[PDB]
């Protein structure tokens, strides 16, 4: 009787991750492998931890403002703040920083013509690329 | 960080005292008088006061405002605080019931200091022993006319209590209704038009009390058998704790039996269209004072199941609906926060901290004979008792 986990969505697209320092979290509409689109989000200290059921990677703050899946958990890069955006059922996934202010998940191509992956930029409260939805 | 909550949940200090059966409770003049007086105080408090009856009832559903927070959120998810259809249903409601109980108890304390008779010490002792009573809705002593609720709860417009100079007085019954002052601006439909809480409405939006009582008596043998099945056929937390991801699929859960009880008070099933009063509606139920007797029994049944099924506690489950303090899609466990309930150390309560109900300063009269006994002995005895009382 095992848990389904959740999809992480931006518009119609969902977060995927594959195995293998750190792999890209790709937002699109093609699931690469079994449960690569399913995530276990748990309370962790004052925030949350975000695990991919397909790849077994944790979403972590990575080298140079990107969000990657890494195989070993690190409390200092794998803890997230999840805050309500103010409309609909969309939230911000945010880097934990004392007295707030951290960078947020920002879904955009690396250059142009894809693929669309996760970066960490300053919060623009009006930016669609930073609005996340969860569906079980 | 900074301080988070203005009113920590701490429960009741001192010796552990029992929550009594409402039938027994009303027979005690000291407990009954203090309850009515304490309830008068809570209800008369300004509705913006977090220690008010209105705000305490407000946590559960509407209004969708933060409760007792020292610092507001930037963007508030406007929803119920209560968690329903989740592994956390039983434990969240345990915490909620104690938040109410402590607020009532603090009010009862100030009340007892006003008695001026030669038995004032007895009134003072009574106030600290005072706990919230329960309606044992699963008990049916094979008597067609039996009702598990006394007239003081469901009929009497005025009740007799003892005044401070020892004299007998009648007061408007604060248990029968809550009168809004004012009606919550964000209530819609019939609820926008109802000045007081309403039980078992008819087509004309008036209270049908005798219809409600008739329905309770008729349902009662069905509830005996159902409560018994709920206590004795569930062996895992998942099946026991909640009504399912499709509401109804866990037909035998504590939550599902508890749902039907709400509809016994709040909603005539024959009406078409349906016309629920406060207790038949999740966003409005907690404003009716009988909510607390109902939930006091849900916590009791939890306590009984826990005893028979020791060390079988919260198991991991999905959170599907966003609630004011829970992320849609997140996994729920025994270490998940139970907003808006904080400890005096300014940490959120977890199911973890309240597995042992005695930590909040209460017990139930059911457990009197097994005090200090082993988990295994307690489990055997209570299993016999459940078979005697609900079999
Ligand atoms: Cu509830
Ligand atoms: Cu309820
Ligand atoms: Ho005692
Ligand atoms: Ho905990
Ligand atoms: Ho635990």
Q: Is B60 annotated as a binding residue?
A: yes
Q: How far is it, in rounded angstroms, from Cα B359 to Cα B376?
A: 21
Place of tokens 């900074």: B2
Residue owning tokens 């309560």: B349
Distance CA A100, CA B291 (A): 39
Give the separation between CA B93 and CA B351, rounded to whole angstroms: 10
- Report the DSSP pairing between strands A91-94 and A81-84: antiparallel
Tell me if B230 sits within 8 A of B304, measured CB to CB.
no
**Count of domains forming chain A:** 1
Instruction: Classify residue A105 by burial, with Cβ atoms within 10 Å: 0-12, 13-18, 19+.
Output: buried
Q: Whole domain around residue A102: which residue ranges?
A: 1-136
Q: What are phi and psi of B19, to 5 degrees?
A: -80, 120
- CATH number, position A70: 2.80.10.50
DSSP 8-state secondary structure symbol assigned to residue B301:
H
- CA B222 vs. chain centroid, Å, equals 22
With CA atoms as reference, the chain B residue closest to A98 would be B1
**Residue B272 is encoded by which pair of tokens?**
């078409």
Strand partners, A66: A119
Residue B93 is labelled as binding a ligand: yes
CA dihedral B155, B265, B354, B338 (to 10 degrees): -120
Identify whether the C-beta of residue B81 lies closer than 8 Å to the C-beta of residue B325.
yes
CB contact under 8 A, A48 and B330: yes
Residues of chain B contacting residue A4, judged by C-beta atoms under 8 Å apart: 318
From the list A42, A84, A89, the residue facing B331 with the nearest CB is A42
Half-sphere exposure in the Cβ direction for B4 (13 Å, CA): 15
For this entry, resolution in Å reads 2.3
**B318 to A91: CB separation less than 8 angstroms, yes or no:** no
- Phi-psi region for residue A110, left (φ > 0), alpha (ψ -120 to 50) or beta? alpha
Give CA–CA dist A34/A48, Å, rounded.
24
From A3, A83, A91, residue closest to B331, measured CB to CB = A3
Chain A residue numbers touching B74 (CB-CB < 8 A): 83, 86
β-strand pairing of B362-363 with B17-18: parallel
> Cβ of B24: how many Cβ atoms within 10 Å?
14
Query: Which residues of chain B make contact with A86, given a CB cutoff of 8 A?
Result: 74-75
d(C-alpha B338, C-alpha B343), whole Å: 11
Name the minimum distance, in Å, from the CA of A37 to any CA of chain B.
Answer: 13
Q: Which CATH number fits domain B1-391: 1.10.1280.10, 1.10.238.10, 1.10.1740.10, 1.10.3210.10?
A: 1.10.1280.10
CA of B125 to the centre of ligand 1 (A): 32
Q: How far is the CA of B361 from the centre of ligand 3 (A)?
A: 13
Q: Which of A6, A37, A87 to mutate to test the interface with B (most CBs of B within 10 A)?
A: A6
Using CA atoms, how far residue B163 sits from B33, B34, B111, B273, B282, in Å, is 8, 10, 11, 45, 36
């Amino acid at each position: 009787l095992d848990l389904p986990g959740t999809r992480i969505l931006n518009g119609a697209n969902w977060a995927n991750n594959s195995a293998t320092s750190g792999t890209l979290i790709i937002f699109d509409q093609s699931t690469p492998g079994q449960d690569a689109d399913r995530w276990l989000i748990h309370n962790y200290l004052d925030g949350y931890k975000i695990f991919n059921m397909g790849s077994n990677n944790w979403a972590s703050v990575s080298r140079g403002n990107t969000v990657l899946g890494v195989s070993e958990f690190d409390g200092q890069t794998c803890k997230w703040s999840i805050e309500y955006s103010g409309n609909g059922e969309e939230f911000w996934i945010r880097v934990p920083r004392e007295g707030g202010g951290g960078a947020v998940w920002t879904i955009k191509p690396a250059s142009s013509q894809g693929p669309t992956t996760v970066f960490l930029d300053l919060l623009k409260e009006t930016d669609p690329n930073q609005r996340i939805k969860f569906a079980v | 960080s900074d301080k988070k909550s203005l009113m920590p949940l701490v429960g009741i200090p001192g010796e552990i005292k029992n929550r009594l059966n409402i039938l027994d409770f009303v027979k005690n003049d000291k407990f009954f008088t203090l309850y009515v007086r304490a309830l008068q105080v809570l209800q008369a408090r300004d509705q913006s006061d977090y220690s008010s009856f209105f705000q305490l009832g407000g946590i559960h559903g509407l209004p969708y405002t933060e409760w007792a927070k020292a610092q507001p959120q930037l963007h508030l998810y406007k929803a119920n605080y209560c968690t329903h259809g989740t592994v956390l249903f039983p434990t969240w409601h345990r915490a909620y019931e104690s938040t109410w109980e402590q607020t009532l108890w603090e009010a009862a304390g100030t009340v007892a200091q006003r008695f001026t008779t030669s038995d004032q010490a007895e009134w003072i002792q009574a106030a600290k022993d005072l706990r919230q009573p329960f309606w044992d809705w699963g008990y049916w002593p094979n008597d067609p006319d039996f009702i598990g609720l006394p007239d003081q709860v469901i009929r009497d417009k005025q009740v007799e209590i003892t005044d401070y100079n020892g004299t007998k007085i009648e007061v408007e019954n604060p248990i029968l209704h809550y009168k809004f002052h004012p009606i919550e601006p964000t209530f819609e439909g019939d609820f926008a038009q109802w000045q007081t809480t309403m039980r078992y409405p008819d087509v004309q939006k008036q209270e049908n009390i005798e219809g409600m009582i008739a329905g309770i008596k008729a349902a009662a043998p069905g509830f005996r058998e159902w409560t018994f099945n709920m206590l004795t056929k569930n062996y895992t937390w998942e099946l026991f704790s909640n009504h399912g991801a499709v509401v109804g699929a866990h037909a035998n859960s504590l939550e599902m039996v508890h749902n039907t009880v709400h509809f016994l008070i709040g909603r005539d099933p024959t009406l078409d269209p349906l016309v629920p009063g406060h207790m038949g509606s999740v966003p409005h139920a907690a404003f009716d004072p009988i909510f607390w007797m109902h939930h006091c029994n849900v916590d009791r049944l939890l306590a009984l199941w826990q005893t028979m099924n020791y060390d079988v506690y919260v198991s991991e489950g999905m959170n599907r609906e966003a609630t004011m303090g829970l992320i849609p899609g997140q996994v729920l466990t025994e270490d998940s926060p139970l907003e808006p309930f904080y400890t005096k150390n300014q940490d959120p309560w977890q199911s973890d901290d309240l597995e042992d109900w005695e930590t909040l300063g209460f017990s139930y009269p059911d457990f009197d004979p097994v005090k200090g006994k082993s988990k295994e002995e307690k489990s055997v005895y209570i299993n016999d008792w459940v078979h005697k009382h609900y079999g």
